[PDB]
């Protein structure tokens, strides 16, 4: 007895493994990511996060990709030495499982994920999707 859960927390494709897709978030208030490995990797895979702004030409087309900073909570001591949030799927992840993730403070209108340089050939074997939460507008 599954509901029409398309509406009431839909989702979109963020990273097919070959290219990213900026996705709007304004309609909702909360959101998170979902990572899926299609094959066994060879090293930890780092992905930088980026947010976009409505291009001045069209108020609902994403502009460039500004990199969102990193926010430490209470016991975070790593700080990623750059304060520019990025997420690294660790090596040895079984290709029948998933992992969650999110940024605690949003900024802009669109979200995009791009594999950090050097670890981009394993990105060809990963799929990242995004889910939202209840509707604001």
């Amino acid at each position: 007895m599954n509901f029409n859960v398309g509406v009431d927390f839909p989702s979109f494709i963020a990273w097919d493994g070959e290219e990213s897709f900026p996705v709007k978030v304004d309609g909702f208030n909360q959101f998170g990511f979902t990572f899926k490995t299609i094959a066994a990797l060879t090293a930890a895979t780092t992905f930088n996060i980026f947010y976009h702004e409505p291009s001045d030409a069209d108020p609902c087309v994403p502009g460039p990709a500004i990199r969102v900073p990193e926010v430490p909570f209470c016991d975070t001591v790593l700080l990623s030495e750059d304060g520019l949030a990025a997420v690294t799927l660790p090596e040895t992840v079984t290709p029948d499982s998933f992992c969650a993730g999110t940024v605690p403070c949003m900024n802009g209108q669109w979200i995009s994920i791009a594999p950090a340089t050097g670890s981009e050939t394993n990105a060809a074997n990963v799929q990242i999707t995004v889910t939202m939460k209840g509707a604001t507008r």
């Binding site: 398309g6 509406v7 709007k24 309609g27 108020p59 609902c60």
Partner: peptide
């Protein structure tokens, strides 16, 4: 039986002139 219930995401402005009866003219 699948059924869709779809909705847009980008709103557009709603601008419109507010034309009014012009300067009074005489039929002659």
């Amino acid at each position: 039986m699948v059924k869709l219930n779809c909705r847009p995401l980008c709103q557009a402005p709603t601008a419109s002139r507010l034309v009014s009866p012009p300067c009074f003219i005489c039929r002659g």
